[model samples]
Target: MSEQNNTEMTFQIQRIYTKDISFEAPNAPHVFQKDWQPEVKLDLDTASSQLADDVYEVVLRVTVTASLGEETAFLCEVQQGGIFSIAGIEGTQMAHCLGAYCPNILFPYARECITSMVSRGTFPQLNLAPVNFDALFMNYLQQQAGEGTEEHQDA
Candidate 1:
């Protein structure tokens, strides 16, 4: 490793906030009267956009739906976002930082938002488990690699 004085890395969390939130219980009181057996499903995604030279906004979207057979008990979604200042790093490392690292930092806040929404909606306490963004990022890279073969076949 060579020491570089000019290209020091910078990583900072500028702000964290909830961008959007939604909770719906179509079956409401009637659904609550049921036996309390719910099948829960979760969906999540993360994306980043540049705001300035070295500043970017990362948003984590999380959705949770609980259903009782043919009826819908409740569905909640939270879009948690953060303003991050990152510099120096680039390429794959930068991609990982924005896709994996930044999301990892924001997951907790998003999880808490989901928990609070579910609770306030009068549904059972719903605590989302921690996500392994690193693993997800690796899988994404693998998928890209698979597509790379087709693009590189030119002789």
Candidate 2:
């Protein structure tokens, strides 16, 4: 009975959803004058909601800003979300699980958004390679292993 109950304490990924994807290239003609140096900045965020007893929606938002010198060259922002029904998880663990899983599912969409934008902007086809989020999350865990700070500690 204990083992049966313990087995029930597992969560699985149910679905993935994406929304609010926008890309803008303000300085199209002028910015392509010279061999431009691109400064790329990436920001990632996540949000969650409960739809049913065990079903939840997890959204991974990726924001990318690319600039050349002081002027804005190109900017693309995408909110690639995932609907994950994560069960048998607690508060902080749920958050961490969603954070760790959602981005993996959504990264391809974000990459496609950038690639499509570049393709349409008269640039060469830029096909981004796949990323391993599992390795990244594992590395994060390894980095936090020895750190004794409260913020670094797992919940």
Lowest summed-lDDT stretch of 10 residues in model 2?
1-10
Candidate 2 lDDT over residue span 54-73, tens digit each: 77777777766767677776
**Candidate 2 collision pairs:** 17-81
lDDT of 1 by residue, 52-117 (tens): 998999998889989877878888888888999998887877888988888788888888888887
Question: Residue 85's C-alpha lDDT in candidate 2?
Answer: 67
Largest TM-score belongs to which candidate? 1
lDDT of each: 0.83, 0.67
**TM-score (C-alpha, index-matched) for candidate 1:** 0.80
Give me the runs in candidate 2 sitting further than 4 Å from their true place: 1-5, 9-14, 124-155
